[PDB]
Amino acid sequence: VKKISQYACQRRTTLNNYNQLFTDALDILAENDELRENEGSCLAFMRASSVLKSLPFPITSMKDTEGIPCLGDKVKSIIEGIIEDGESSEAKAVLNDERYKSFKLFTSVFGVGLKTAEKWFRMGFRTLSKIQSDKSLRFTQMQKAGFLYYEDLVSCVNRPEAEAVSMLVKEAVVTFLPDALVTMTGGFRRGKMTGHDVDFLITSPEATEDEEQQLLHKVTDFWKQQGLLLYCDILESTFEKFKQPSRKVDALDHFQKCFLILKLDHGRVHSQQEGKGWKAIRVDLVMCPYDRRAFALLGWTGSRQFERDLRRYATHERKMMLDNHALYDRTKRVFLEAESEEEIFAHLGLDYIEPWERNA
DNA sequence: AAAAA
DNA sequence: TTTTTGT
DNA sequence: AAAAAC
Ligand SMILES: Nc1ccn([C@H]2CC[C@@H](COP(=O)(O)OP(=O)(O)OP(=O)(O)O)O2)c(=O)n1
Ligand SMILES: [Mg+2]
Ligand code: NA
């Protein structure tokens, strides 16, 4: 009987999606607008898809869309077409578009984003084999790893694999920092069965500034000694307790982090042919100062749409500024502290949304 | 593309 | 109508 | 560099 909010942070979105026919089409249309750099149309299709994912029933008529926010005329035409014959002519045209197909294929490589994919398409490349064998192209260390471990990285990480990775991370971390708190974040924290990677947040209540800085180096050196580190990139912290973010679009937070590819031996997975006996897994580790742990956990849990709307709600409804490191109140002119995610939600005047309810 | 200012 | 859309 | 990694 209540009104569905336009904000994902005011909706409970579990993995039980009753509208996959509509949201799969809307996700394709959004992805195409992202590729065509049409940010506004992209966001409108992402918001429409997100709200339909929150519904406790499937849409079976146009009357069912009444009172649902983020569904304008364009989105309602797409829903009408899917109700008509079970297909989206708009999404079908995108799936057959050469630019869209090439972008999906090229960006599926680790180390290849929008700019490199667009460059290769405009050069006339259409297959990964023709890219890899070209004698004029030069590849980054990230792309070399992306091509070498391609098949493993494109097959998604399942729950037994994520759990096996969690054990490896926790065992390595507590060996060097016994009081450290390790939390698996991302999709797996939200209850997902699969993911493109396994993400972790690491924090320590008693570690020194040096101990905190050295942990990622100690843990990765230990794995390097065991020949388990297939790719490793450690980004030093640029965290400053009172500095403003400076960048209008900063994809990464300022905490110390590492982007890894780990060699996951089959014997460690408690879940068929064996093969090489191991699988390459994308793993991200984030180290944050103990007092920022709630902001970092909230930002790394996701989903991306839940994070966007949290920040949008904070700005437009509360005149607050939120990020992975802090929460600032522009009216009271004070930073708001939090020991848990619950305290962040309470500062924002939001009902607490459980991690498994953040799948917007 | 949709909603707010 | 013009502005905003996370970061 | 730009670009990529969330
Ligand atoms: N544009 C983005 C990308 C990521 N994140 C945050 C929320 C998720 C977290 C981890 O990023 P991903 O690994 O890409 O997210 P995911 O939710 O874990 O999905 P997947 O299960 O595919 O790894 O970082 C975000 O706020 N905004
Ligand atoms: Mg993830
Ligand atoms: Na990529």
Cα four-point dihedral sign A34, A40, A41, A43:
positive
Query: Tokens 């990480």 identify what position?
Result: A157
Q: Would you tell me which CATH number, out of the four given (3.30.1450.10, 3.40.50.10800, 2.60.120.480, 1.10.150.20), belongs to the domain A97-155?
A: 1.10.150.20
Q: How far is the CA of A71 from the C1' of B5 (A)?
A: 20
Amino acid at A228: L
**Shortest-distance atom of ligand 1 to CA A156:** 22
* CATH fold match for the domains A1-96 and A291-359: no
Helices H, strands E: what count in chain A? 15, 10
Amino acid at A25: A
> Hey, how many other C-beta atoms are within 10 angstroms of the C-beta on A295?
23
* Domain A291-359, CATH: 3.30.210.10
Closest CA to A82 of A63, A54, A59, A100: A59
- In the Cβ-directed half-sphere of A219, how many Cα atoms lie within 13 Å? 33
Q: In whole angstroms, what is the distance from residue A318 CA to residue A312 CA?
A: 9
Q: How far is the CA of A142 from the C1' of D2 (A)?
A: 15
Q: Would you tell me which CATH number, out of the four given (1.10.10.10, 1.10.101.10, 3.40.50.300, 3.30.460.10), belongs to the domain A156-290?
A: 3.30.460.10
Q: In whole angstroms, what is the distance from residue A258 CA to residue A260 CA?
A: 6
Reported in sequence order, the residue ranges of chain A that DSSP labels E, i.e. its strands, are 157-158, 181-184, 194-195, 198-203, 229-235, 256-265, 278-287, 320-322, 327-329, 334-335
Q: Write down which residues 68-127 in A have CB closer than 7 A to strand B.
A: 69-76
Q: Residue A238 is encoded by which pair of tokens?
A: 């640029």
A248 touches strand C (CB under 7 A): yes
Which fold is adopted by the domain A1-96?
A: DNA polymerase; domain 1 (1.10.150)
Kind plus residue range of the DSSP H or E element containing A165: helix A159-176
The CA angle A181-A183-A187, to the nearest 5 degrees, is 170
Q: Write down which residues 251-270 in A have CB closer than 7 A to strand D.
A: 251-252, 259
Domain boundaries, chain A: 1-96, 97-155, 156-290, 291-359
Name the residue at shortest CA distance from atom 24 of ligand 1.
Answer: A300
Q: In whole angstroms, what is the distance from residue A341 CA to residue A314 CA?
A: 15
Contacts for A218 with CB less than 8 Å, ≥ 6 apart: A176
Q: In whole angstroms, what is the distance from residue A78 CA to residue A72 CA?
A: 10
Q: Which nucleotides of D are covered by protein (CB under 7 A)?
A: 2-6
For residue A279, the cross-strand partners are: A264
Q: How far is the CA of A40 from the C1' of C2 (A)?
A: 15
